[PDB]
Every structure is written in structure tokens, then in C-alpha cells.
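Hey all, sorry for the wall of text incoming. These are the four entities for the joint prediction.
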Amino acid sequence: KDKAKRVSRNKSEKKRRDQFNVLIKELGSMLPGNARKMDKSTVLQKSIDFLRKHKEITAWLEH
Amino acid sequence: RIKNAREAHSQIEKRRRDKMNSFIDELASLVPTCNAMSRKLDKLTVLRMAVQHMKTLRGA
DNA sequence: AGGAACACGTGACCC
DNA sequence: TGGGTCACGTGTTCC
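and here's what came out:
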């Protein structure tokens, strides 16, 4: 009769996983590009590239 | 015998988790509000802060 | 104590 | 087929 807590915990865990996927999809929809499907890691990797690149170019544009 | 196979699979799986985590850390290092932080932020916050940061940039 | 974030191992599916 | 990602349920850690 502890199924209730397990079930609830499963619901809670799923909600985090889903928020996480939602955030990933949003990062990806924001990258210069772009051609899905990148997998999650690729989205992250390409997000990193974008910020380093924007940093470089943006810095360069002065001094 | 094919117990090795299952452990192989579960190792592949850990390699991916570890890679994503490092990417999350690396991303956080690139978002100033996260960077400025003593306590490590959780993974969802880091993602939320990173998209926030990106909407910040397009406004120049 | 107990929940939120995190880590794990495995079944379903894919190329 | 091999070997990879993903969603899941549940074990582990931390506050």
C-alpha cells in the first residue's frame, strides 16, 4: 500500500525530466542554424560553441 | 555469459550522462550569473539561466 | 525525516 | 547485429 508514494515520486521525477527536455528544445530553437534533430548533448555542445563564438566576435569588435 | 553485454550497455549509458553533465558545467561557466556563484546551481536553473542569457544578447 | 536533485541500470527503439 | 539515445523506475546524496 506504498504504491501511492512510489507513483507520486515517479510523477515528480517525470516532471523534472520533461522540464529538462523543454529547456533543451528552447536552447536549440535559439541557436544560429538550424537543422534538427540534434540530440540533447549536441544542443548543449552547440550552445557552448555559440557563446564562445559570440564572445570572441563581440570582444574583437572593440579593442 | 552475456552479463558483460548488459554492463557494456549500462557503461555506454553512464558515458552519456557524464558528457551531458560536463556540458552543463561548461555552459554554466559561460553564463555570468552562474559563474558568479559560490554554491553550484542545479541543472534546470543552469538551463533556465542560459536561455535567459541568450535572450539578453539579441537585445543590442 | 523526508523531499528535491542526482545517479543508476534496463527495456524499447533506432540506424 | 552493434552499439547508440531516450524514458522510465527506483537507488543515493544532500540539505
